[PDB]
Amino acid sequence: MVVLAVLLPVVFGALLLLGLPRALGVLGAGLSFLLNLYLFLTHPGGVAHAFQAPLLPGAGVYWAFGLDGLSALFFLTIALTVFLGALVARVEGRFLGLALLMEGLLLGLFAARDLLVFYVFFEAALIPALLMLYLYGGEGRTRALYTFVLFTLVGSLPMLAAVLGARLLSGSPTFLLEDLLAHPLQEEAAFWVFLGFALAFAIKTPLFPLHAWLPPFHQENHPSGLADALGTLYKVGVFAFFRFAIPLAPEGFAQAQGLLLFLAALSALYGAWVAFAAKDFKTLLAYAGLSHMGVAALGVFSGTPEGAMGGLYLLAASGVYTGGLFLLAGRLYERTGTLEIGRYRGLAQSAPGLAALALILFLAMVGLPGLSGFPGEFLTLLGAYKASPWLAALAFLSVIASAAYALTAFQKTFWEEGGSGVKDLAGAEWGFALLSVLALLLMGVFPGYFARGLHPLAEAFAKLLGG
Amino acid sequence: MALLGTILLPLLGFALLGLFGKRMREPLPGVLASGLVLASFLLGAGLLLSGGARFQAEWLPGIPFSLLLDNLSGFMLLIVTGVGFLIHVYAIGYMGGDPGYSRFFAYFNLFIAMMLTLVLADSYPVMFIGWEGVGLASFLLIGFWYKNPQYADSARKAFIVNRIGDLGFMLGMAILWALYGTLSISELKEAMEGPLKNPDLLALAGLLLFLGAVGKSAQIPLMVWLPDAMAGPTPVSALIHAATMVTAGVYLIARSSFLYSVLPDVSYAIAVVGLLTAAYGALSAFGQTDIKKIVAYSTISQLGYMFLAAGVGAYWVALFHVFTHAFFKALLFLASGSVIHALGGEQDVRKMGGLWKHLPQTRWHALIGALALGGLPLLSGFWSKDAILAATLTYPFGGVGFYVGALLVAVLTAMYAMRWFVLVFLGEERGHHHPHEAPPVMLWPNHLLALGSVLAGYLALPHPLPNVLEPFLKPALAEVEAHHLSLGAEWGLIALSAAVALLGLWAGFVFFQRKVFPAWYLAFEAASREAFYVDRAYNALIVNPLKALAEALFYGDRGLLSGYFGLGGAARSLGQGLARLQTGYLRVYALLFVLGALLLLGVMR
Incomplete structure (x- = not known):
């Protein structure tokens, strides 16, 4: 059942940290991958395997779990990405444990069927992230850490008032999501609570003015970018919005919608555009992530089930291809020793199939049809265009800037005249590669099958904004 | 399901040659590629002759995966897979001693598969899969020898400028979702019959579809991306400039014949942009001191011709030109490609000349080609060109300013073709070449191309001579009409096209022989270069x-x-x-x- 799939990477990570050796946590992430996939296939529906247990009975906090049409793949996606992180890896700190921990944590995050437990996981995921940051490398480790951590925390602590306000002002008996939705908040109560959800959710999305933490985080982790790959699976803001923020207090979102769509747009454009100027992989992938999130959020904010489904989908898959690009970047680090874009040009003749792998990944990134990005990007386009067309448009001078940065990077890294020559592919990197390509191709070619669970949620919570 | 096979074979093949392919002997990736392409054409023509084909499949909700194979789709499919196959075999020839044979023919199969995906679509997002895909494979082939900096950035610029167009395409595509909610071209057309609604928004969607088309067919302002596509191996330039790619610019309009046939403003503008593209491409054509570029500008020019055709509501005419042109342009490019396999890629004009006697059989090829582009009175390019010139006058949206202009453009398209042929094959000698020149598997299909060049021709002949093509094209899609036609004067018009083209070719022959190249014109040669x-x-x-x-x-x-x-x-x-x-x-x-x-x-x- 659900809780097992939730817990599996968590235990394996501990067994990696204190435990020996490094190798086992790899198949740990693999096992998580397989089970999460197993729950993905055989799903009955919204309930799946339901879980309820007392936590603070008197407070009204209970352990509440299950797989939605949403929670779903996100187990598969996260399990996957983190698995690649485990295998291809090479951080191998014995903090691949810190990674498996972080994976499991995120799994618990998506499965939360009640608000306060969700809150709990939401705050908990911070620690390995800061650790695999801090003690697992970087010179500017401590300041980047205070940046990432304090942004998240300053965002977070006030939300507890809203999560209290959501329960307390609505007179909801418990923190159970069902219950909370069953008692809607009124005008200028739902306002404040939605706002309090909206700050913590916006800063973790990220949207335009609040993204300033993202480039420093990804730079200073262990260069393979296991910590980074898991950091991107931590970008969960959109999911939190659609699942929690909007449905618990939609009346406020009705007011905020214009601004949110705008910010999503400007995040997308600015993100892809600024990404161009980036001189290193960490920064580049950061701004790119910002653009994608812009798109997703744009999709969600429009109402319009089309756009929303596009947003959540784009999120799910971009976790995978972004995390993949991170691990890949680290793997070329270990063989070279540098994350710089300009130096060490020749690769493509020197590297037999990497050009193909990295290319596949980047194609998935720019949102080319047949790969994971396009379905989400497109459906998003549709919905964004439905609510505010202009913001869909501004947001969609994205594809231009996106192809720009992605192709510039790919060319200057791979295509040109020979250097010394490079190591071909690692045995971990092969599993990484093939599995990656499989994921990207399958989510790209059959956007129907994945995201079918997204479809009921999409239109229902869109009509939630209706009469 | 059989319909999907056509797409599947040069993917399965692509996948063999990209994945393995270096595991193959030097002929073999070419042999596989050309083999899968061979029965794609064949095995899809079986479908076309059997009356039609349909495919509908699971995808994004509300947007199923729908392939419609009808007359309009079949015409394109035969052109693409046939000429594409010829180019596959030719590529078996011209690619030799070059590592990544695998890479090349993988890329080739891939390209074929993608185009087949584009033209067979009953839904616009499937069409879009086609678009971005073909753009991608172009990117991939253009940079095939990657060790050179110049042929890298080329493809980058391609896919960027092109993605501006794809962005237009996406936007227009989003526009007709909010509006109708189908996004399947058949039901989207059946939903567009009658009173319509909110005409401004429809015109916008079609205009963005066009903003895409401009990118894909290399019209103005996005014109700029095509000339630098010379970088890739010549048969790649053959595939892009003739049998694939730009043609889809026209095809998007042709399937959308229903959409544009109700849009007077947009169509007026389409014809305007077509005319300007033709004229621009032609004026700047001859000044070029390189053999490849000077042909690429004729590509631009002639596609301008086609967009002029599809502009005034003559869709089948635009497709006629697409057809004839698909023959004679492929002929030109494969010719020029043969030429520099002889000089070891010397690829210059001022560094060339006087190849007539020394080159057997190639002279015939390049001559037939340059004459068809010049629109020689009995040859394809002629029939297509005044099919267009007449369609100008006869069809709605008026063609009075346009006719004369297009006629002057016919003069120039004659002139530059002749400068090309003159500067390449005549006027003393420079450089070096020794024994073999043409191998068997290049000129053998190139011959067939010359054949098709001459005789694309009479498939549509002004009306007492049978118009075989128009009925083929009109019913299945390309639906809506509203045209006058006239006679006695009309043969006067055909006579005018013939006479003017004939005069223009010889004026080109002498001038561009000349040597004086006097005064202002040299500046014109600079500007055009x-x-x-x-x-x-x-x-x-x-x-x-x-x-x-x-x-x-x-x-x-x-x-x-x-x-x-x-x-x-x-x-x-x-x-x-x-x-x-x-x-x-x-x-x-x-x-x-x-x-x-x-x-x-x-x-x-």
């Missing part, structure tokens, strides 16, 4: 400024981060002001104490 200085202007307020704005916004973002640090320090500071509040003197603590307490008791009321 430099493409009338467009790119310099695109990096003026467009490219370099956007590039700089990336940086500007970057530094802005950096500064943002720094300001946040500013807040951190503000809280720190405030904090130590509060920590400065404690001096350490007891009397200080006592006074601060009583102070605080009075503050509280004050608060209590």
Whole structure:
């Protein structure tokens, strides 16, 4: 059942940290991958395997779990990405444990069927992230850490008032999501609570003015970018919005919608555009992530089930291809020793199939049809265009800037005249590669099958904004 | 399901040659590729002759995966797979001793599969899969020899400028979702019959579809991307400029014949842009001192011709030109390609000349080609060209200003073709070549291309001579009409096209023989060689400024981060002001104490 799939990477990570050796946590992430996939296939529906247990009975906090049409793949996606992180890896700190921990944590995050437990996981995921940051490398480790951590925390602590306000002002008996939705908040109560959800959710999305933490985080982790790959699976803001923020207090979102769509747009454009100027992989992938999130959020904010489904989908898959690009970047680090874009040009003749792998990944990134990005990007386009067309448009001078940065990077890294020559592919990197390509191709070619669970949620919570 | 096979074979093959392919002997990736392409054409023509085909499949909700194979789709499919196959075999020839044979033919199969995906679509997002896909495979082939810096950036520019168009395409596609909600071309057309609704928005959607088309068919302003596509191996340039790619620019309009046939403004503009593209491409054509580029400008010009056709509501005519052109352009490019396999890629004009006697059988090829492009009175390019010239006058949207212009453009398209052939094959000698020149598997299909060139021809002949093509094209899709036609004067018109073209070819023969090239014209040769200085202007307020704005916004973002640090320090500071509040003197603590307490008791009321 659900809780097992939730817990599996968590235990394996501990067994990696204190435990020996490094190798086992790899198949740990693999096992998580397989089970999460197993729950993905055989799903009955919204309930799946339901879980309820007392936590603070008197407070009204209970352990509440299950797989939605949403929670779903996100187990598969996260399990996957983190698995690649485990295998291809090479951080191998014995903090691949810190990674498996972080994976499991995120799994618990998506499965939360009640608000306060969700809150709990939401705050908990911070620690390995800061650790695999801090003690697992970087010179500017401590300041980047205070940046990432304090942004998240300053965002977070006030939300507890809203999560209290959501329960307390609505007179909801418990923190159970069902219950909370069953008692809607009124005008200028739902306002404040939605706002309090909206700050913590916006800063973790990220949207335009609040993204300033993202480039420093990804730079200073262990260069393979296991910590980074898991950091991107931590970008969960959109999911939190659609699942929690909007449905618990939609009346406020009705007011905020214009601004949110705008910010999503400007995040997308600015993100892809600024990404161009980036001189290193960490920064580049950061701004790119910002653009994608812009798109997703744009999709969600429009109402319009089309756009929303596009947003959540784009999120799910971009976790995978972004995390993949991170691990890949680290793997070329270990063989070279540098994350710089300009130096060490020749690769493509020197590297037999990497050009193909990295290319596949980047194609998935720019949102080319047949790969994971396009379905989400497109459906998003549709919905964004439905609510505010202009913001869909501004947001969609994205594809231009996106192809720009992605192709510039790919060319200057791979295509040109020979250097010394490079190591071909690692045995971990092969599993990484093939599995990656499989994921990207399958989510790209059959956007129907994945995201079918997204479809009921999409239109229902869109009509939630209706009469 | 059988319909999907056509697409599947040169993917399965592509996948063999990309994945393995280097595991194959030097002929074999070419043999596989050309083999899978061979029965794609074949095994899809089986479908076409059997009356039609349909496919519908699971995809994004509301947008199923729908392939419709009808007359309009079949015509394109036969062109693409046939000429494409010829180019596959030719590529078996011209690619030799070059590593990544695998890579090449993988890319080739892949390309074929993608185009088949594009033209067979009953839904616009499937069509879009086609679009972005074909753009991608172009990118991939153009950079095939990657060790060169110049042929890298080419493809980058391609896919960027092109993605501007794809963005238009996406936008227009989103426009017709909010509107109708189908996005399947058949039901989207059946939904567009009758009164319509909100005409401004429809015109916008079609206009963005066109903004895409401009990119894909290399019209103005996005014209600029095509000339640099010379970089890739010549049969790649053959595939792009003739049998694939730009043609889809026209095809998108042709399937959308239903959409544009109700849009007078947009169609007027389409014809305008077609005319300007033709004229531009033709004027700047001859000044070119390179053999490849000088042909590429004829590509641009002739596609301009087609867009002029599809502009005034003559869709089948635009497709006629597409057909004839598909023959004679492929002929030209494969010719020129053969030429520089002989000089070891010397690929120059002023460094060339006087190849007539020394080159057997090639002279015939390039001559047939340049004459068809010139629109020689009995040859394909002729029939297509005045099919268009007449369609100008006869069809709606008026063609009066357009006719004369297009006729002058016919003069120039004659002239530059002749400069090409003259400067290449005549006028003394420069350089070096020794024994073999043409191998068997190049000129053998190139011959067939010359054949098709001459006889594409009479498939549509002005009306008493049978119009075989028009009925084929009109019913299945390309639906709506409203045209007058006239006679006795009309053969006068055909006579005019013939006479004017004939005059133009010879004027071209002498001038571009000349040697005086007198006065202003040399400046004209500079400007035409430099493409009338467009790119310099695109990096003026467009490219370099956007590039700089990336940086500007970057530094802005950096500064943002720094300001946040500013807040951190503000809280720190405030904090130590509060920590400065404690001096350490007891009397200080006592006074601060009583102070605080009075503050509280004050608060209590």
